[PDB]
Amino acid sequence: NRQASEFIPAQGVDEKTLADAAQLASLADETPEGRSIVILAKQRFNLRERDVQSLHATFVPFTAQSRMSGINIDNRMIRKGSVDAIRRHVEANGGHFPTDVDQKVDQVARQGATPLVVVEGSRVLGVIALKDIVKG
Fold this sequence. Notes:
This protein is of the alpha+beta class.
């Protein structure tokens, strides 16, 4: 029961850029956070959505084996996963993640938030830090 609250760009990408890919990687997530992140992009920086139907792209539902999910489309190939899953995915792409942001992911954990990392191509475009919310 966690909702995205703020996200920081990986080095080389603007945070709004991170939010847009944060969305398309999170379209097909069936996790409660999957909706929180797509709303995090709109409220925080940019009310924006996905564009698979215009490019004929494919959604990749989240799997627990990799603990991550994402989307492939004509113009983008982005994923969002736990920092452990995504970081392995960047090196497997042959790409690299920004340590300053992997550290910011670590800071989201110490505050009790869940750092999801989203990548585009083989690199990370930023982390989405999700925070816990109180009901009633």
